[PDB]
Amino acid sequence: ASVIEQCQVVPSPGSATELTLPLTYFDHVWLAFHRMRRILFYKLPISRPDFVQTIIPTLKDSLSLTLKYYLPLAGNVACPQDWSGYPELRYVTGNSVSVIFSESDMDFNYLIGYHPRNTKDFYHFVPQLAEPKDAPGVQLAPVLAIQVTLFPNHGISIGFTNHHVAGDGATIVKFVRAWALLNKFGGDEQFLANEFIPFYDRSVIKDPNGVGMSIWNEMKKYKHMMKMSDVVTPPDKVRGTFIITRHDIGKLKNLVLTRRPKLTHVTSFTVTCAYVWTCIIKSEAATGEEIDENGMEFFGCAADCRAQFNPPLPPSYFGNALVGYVARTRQVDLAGKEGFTIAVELIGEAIRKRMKDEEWILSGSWFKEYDKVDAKRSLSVAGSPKLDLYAADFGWGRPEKLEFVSIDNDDGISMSLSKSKDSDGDLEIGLSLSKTRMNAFAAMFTHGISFL
Amino acid sequence: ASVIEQCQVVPSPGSATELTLPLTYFDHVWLAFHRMRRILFYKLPISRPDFVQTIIPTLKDSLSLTLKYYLPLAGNVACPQDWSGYPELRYVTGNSVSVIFSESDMDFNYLIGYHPRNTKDFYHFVPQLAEPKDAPGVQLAPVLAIQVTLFPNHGISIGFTNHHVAGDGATIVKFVRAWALLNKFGGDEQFLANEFIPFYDRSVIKDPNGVGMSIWNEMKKYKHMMKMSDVVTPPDKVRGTFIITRHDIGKLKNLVLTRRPKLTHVTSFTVTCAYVWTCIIKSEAATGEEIDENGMEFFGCAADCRAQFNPPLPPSYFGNALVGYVARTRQVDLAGKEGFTIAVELIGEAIRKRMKDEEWILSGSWFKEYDKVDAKRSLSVAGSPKLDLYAADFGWGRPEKLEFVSIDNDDGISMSLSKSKDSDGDLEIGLSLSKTRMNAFAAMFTHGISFL
The missing domain is CATH 3.30.559.10 (Chloramphenicol acetyltransferase-like domain)
Structure with missing residues (x-):
């Protein structure tokens, strides 16, 4: 109205x-x-x-x-x-x-x-x-x-x-x-x-x-x-938030350490995404499905480039400064037992690779050439822990709920990520899925953490 | 032929x-x-x-x-x-x-x-x-x-x-x-x-x-x-074995200790069943389902009574000496986060209750009066860790696989349990389910343990 x-x-x-x-x-x-x-x-x-x-x-x-x-x-x-x-x-x-x-x-x-x-x-x-x-x-x-x-x-x-x-x-x-x-x-x-x-x-x-x-x-x-x-075009899917918790992230990091005790790059972000990633992959099997356990599977995300040699770009520079990172693996192993450990390995080294790598942005701009991925078989992250749009107090106080509505339209699975409203170090995961997938996934998420 | x-x-x-x-x-x-x-x-x-x-x-x-x-x-x-x-x-x-x-x-x-x-x-x-x-x-x-x-x-x-x-x-x-x-x-x-x-x-x-x-x-x-x-009547369901491992049992026991540090009765059996129990309950949600999250849920199993005051019955006594133990709870809580901890509480205290309780066998034989359970909403265990039918060497060596075929006919979910063929302390879980349920469950089992 x-x-x-x-x-x-x-x-x-x-x-x-x-x-x-x-x-x-x-x-x-x-x-x-x-x-x-x-x-x-x-x-x-x-x-x-x-x-x-x-x-x-x-x-x-x-x-x-x-x-x-x-x-x-x-x-x-x-x-x-x-x-x-x-x-x-x-x-x-x-x-x-x-x-x-x-x-x-x-x-x-x-x-x-x-x-x-x-x-x-x-x-x-x-x-x-x-x-x-x-x-x-x-x-x-x-x-x-x-x-x-x-x-x-x-x-x-x-x-x-x-x-x-x-x-x-x-x-x-x-x-x-x-x-x-x-x-x-x-x-x-x-x-x-x-x-x-x-x-x-x-x-x-x-x-x-x-x-x-x-x-x-x-x-x-x-x-x-x-x-x-x-x-x-609004689709009939279902949208729900998931809260992975300061503690739970700690427990995950802990798990990595123990098992694969190399690896410098084990940040909250990378355990979180790595976790979700495996739940996606694992929850798909649950919903009676024909799936190529041998076909490749992707994970992607956008960096923010303002930290970039020269002098790092003014943190207020206006346009876009996103660059994509992509991880890849066969579903077989991502769905098998050391899957989360492997998830963290991949996602982590995807980043640890093209970091202070200014050359690859400016030259070898075939950063624009990451075009052999199956959009249908991939997982794209939207936000970032850094971004606190929960701080947007207009005078009526901070908000009650955030919704990234455009995670819907993606050609194969996208997830929102932001800080919790509430407890300092907890994170919110947004997802948009078919009701049965969503059910499947909510149960996987909730199962893994409860053993942590 | x-x-x-x-x-x-x-x-x-x-x-x-x-x-x-x-x-x-x-x-x-x-x-x-x-x-x-x-x-x-x-x-x-x-x-x-x-x-x-x-x-x-x-x-x-x-x-x-x-x-x-x-x-x-x-x-x-x-x-x-x-x-x-x-x-x-x-x-x-x-x-x-x-x-x-x-x-x-x-x-x-x-x-x-x-x-x-x-x-x-x-x-x-x-x-x-x-x-x-x-x-x-x-x-x-x-x-x-x-x-x-x-x-x-x-x-x-x-x-x-x-x-x-x-x-x-x-x-x-x-x-x-x-x-x-x-x-x-x-x-x-x-x-x-x-x-x-x-x-x-x-x-x-x-x-x-x-x-x-x-x-x-x-x-x-x-x-x-x-x-x-x-x-x-052979049904079209699907039958698969699951191996929970000496180590993994240890990890579970460990988990209980930490969280609910009372409780004397935390044996391999009771973590195992407690684990399966929650996977059953949790994996059902995964398969798009109308389920009464408020309705009660049962777990049952047969004791062996030969240890019984008088003098404990000769361990070779011929007939039956089984008595049933039953645990009960609303699905709501069994499917929520402290579910496994609660599973162990219930299953454990079901046993810790009617143990050396000879009276309840002989008198109050309303051991035969456990007839307010919903067979359809329950989980019945077949074998026992004790029973090693893998020791049945006929001369051609020990067997390769055991199958308890009659876990099929049950009116609501039954699971086999025996010693592994192989590694001293590992256990085999037998199940018989609809292909989609089975898929769902195999993914839950395999997910929880991999965070252990």
């Missing part, structure tokens, strides 16, 4: 008029990627009246204020039509962010549970995101849209939809964080920490090998691959 | 002519129970000729010799037709054991694997067991039948079918053991250990409370319940 659309939410008075940003080679690939959807739920004893009275005006302000900092987010990513080259992120005085305030009679308490919940109901709280308009010899595409949604008496949700080409994940979260700060302290910029102020000037993304060009004036020939429209 | 039936295999020259044994209250209940089927496989480079030349005559001898000791096994259990009372085990000079030697072109190596195997193919190697004949005012039923089966070039199987009213499990295994000894040493009785010589005279089964009568002249009214005929 719709309350008021602010088709416009322009950046605050003091904002610049020109901001156009040509895409780094980091940005290019995301053009062929679907859009990102996150929701934040906030438990509140809020009435409708004062949602309209307060929440709207105050959010409306604090937002525009935010955008004066995170300017491209009102912008539009320009996409070249002929073989002229250079996609830019463009912002011009006039264009703005679409936000919708809606009200909803759905069970809040249900939605914010950790128990598996019908995946299709989360699309109601994430904005749909406008259709492409035209400029000369180019076409523009909205980069961000917000839905704020009241649950009379229980809380507010805040949905976000955005193009990965603009954002980063690291970059988008900084932005929410900052918007929250700005609302929380009623737009006193003296509260906006250095860390939440974006750093724009590119070229600090040095590119000697002309890969920004190369990695593009070649994609430039497959535009049907780069869907410019945001087309959402 | 049939080679030669010895419709007769009478006991050796020196045998007694009269042996009739009235049933203890231990024996009565087994009248309403289906028959027991076990197979032993022996890996051998054996040709057909010398199977006929040697194996047959030699087995044929050693067997009759054995039966001169274990006499009732040629007998017939008499079943009263009018309300006169007293079922007896009867043997008379003349009656004998039916044995069949057959040959088979099925893959031996397949059958003796631990991998799940089509349950229906094991009925080919266990004898069918004759139809009831008549005596005046009574009807007789064969108590035992043997099938010996050649696999040209790979081995011999030895199937057994028998009425639980005669045997015991403890009693039947002693008997195989003894037959093996007798063949192995070419019928030199000086090799037959005191332990393998049955003790017959009852009344050492003291009964002051007249329960032999009571617990019968009441069953005496439901004879359609006591199927006198052996009617076999």
Whole structure:
């Protein structure tokens, strides 16, 4: 149910008029990627009246204020039509962010549970995101849209939809964080920490090998691959959160040590993913299935490159700086007894390999050449322990539940990962699966840990 | 394919002519129970000729010799037709054991694997067991039948079918053991250990409370319940062995100690069953299922009573001396995280309760009154770690694989348990399940231990 659309939410008075940003080679690939959807739920004893009275005006302000900092987010990513080259992120005085305030009679308490919940109901709280308009010899595409949604008496949700080409994940979260700060302290910029102020000037993304060009004036020939429209198809899968616990991580690390006592790279992340990985693989057998126990199996994830020789890139640099790491193995051994130990070996050495490896980013940019993986047989991680979007206090306190809605659309299994709401060192795992798989998996997760 | 039936295999020259044994209250209940089927496989480079030349005559001898000791096994259990009372085990000079030697072109190596195997193919190697004949005012039923089966070039199987009213499990295994000894040493009785010589005279089964009568002249009214005929229906389920390992048991015991550091009763048996129990319960959820997480769940098993104040019953006493122990709990908690710990608590205290408790056997014989359990929602254990039927060396060495075929027919989940073939302290778990359940379970078993 719709309350008021602010088709416009322009950046605050003091904002610049020109901001156009040509895409780094980091940005290019995301053009062929679907859009990102996150929701934040906030438990509140809020009435409708004062949602309209307060929440709207105050959010409306604090937002525009935010955008004066995170300017491209009102912008539009320009996409070249002929073989002229250079996609830019463009912002011009006039264009703005679409936000919708809606009200909803759905069970809040249900939605914010950790128990598996019908995946299709989360699309109601994430904005749909406008259709492409035209400029000369180019076409523009909205980069961000917000839905704020009241649950009379229980809380507010805040949905976000955005193009990965603009954002980063690291970059988008900084932005929410900052918007929250700005609302929380009623737009006193003296509260906006250095860390939440974006750093724009590119070229600090040095590119000697002309890969920004190369990695593009070649994609430039497959535009049907780069869907410019945001087309959402909610699937019937099921979405549930899993909490692996400070202690339990410890126990896992402990297990590794004992068994394979080499290995420098045994971090929380890598035990966690390694654990999930084996549960996925193991839980599949459980659901009566024809599976090639001999076929290869993949795990992948995106780094964040800002730590990079030269001087490590300013931790506020705006675009994308993701690079993918991939692990691989036959299912046979991943499903057999020393599977978790092997999982940790692989995932770990996937990272320990291409770390301070600047060459492989800039040169041998066949970082863009990890294209012999079976998307269908793989496991992709979304977030990062580092990213604490649970810190996004808007004034109504921290959130009750996070949902990374766009882990759904992936062609073969994707998992969210963030810090717990609650206990310092615990982690949240998000998953989106067929109800029977989900059942299978929830039982494997819960079984292994209980022997730890 | 049939080679030669010895419709007769009478006991050796020196045998007694009269042996009739009235049933203890231990024996009565087994009248309403289906028959027991076990197979032993022996890996051998054996040709057909010398199977006929040697194996047959030699087995044929050693067997009759054995039966001169274990006499009732040629007998017939008499079943009263009018309300006169007293079922007896009867043997008379003349009656004998039916044995069949057959040959088979099925893959031996397949059958003796631990991998799940089509349950229906094991009925080919266990004898069918004759139809009831008549005596005046009574009807007789064969108590035992043997099938010996050649696999040209790979081995011999030895199937057994028998009425639980005669045997015991403890009693039947002693008997195989003894037959093996007798063949192995070419019928030199000086090799037959005191332990393998049955003790017959009852009344050492003291009964002051007249329960032999009571617990019968009441069953005496439901004879359609006591199927006198052996009617076999092979089901399509799947049968696979699981090896929990000396070490792994240790690790489990260790886990208990740490968590619930009270509890005297934490034996291998009770961790093992407790473990399986939780895997059963947990693996059911995995297979997309409607299940009452609030409904009660049972575990049961048969003791062996020979250790019993008076003087503990001669360890060779012939009949049955089984009593059932039952544990119970809601599925909810058995499937949740402290499930295995709770499993051990329950199973353990089920035993630690009615141990040296002679009263509860003789008096309060409402040991026979454990009849509020949901057979459908329960887990029944067959064998015992003690019983080493792997020691049955006939001369061709110890066996390659044991199969307790009659764990199939149970109305809700039954598991075999014996010593490993191989490593001193490891245990074998037998199960018979629907292929999808079986898959589910094999993955749970294998997952939990790998974190141990």
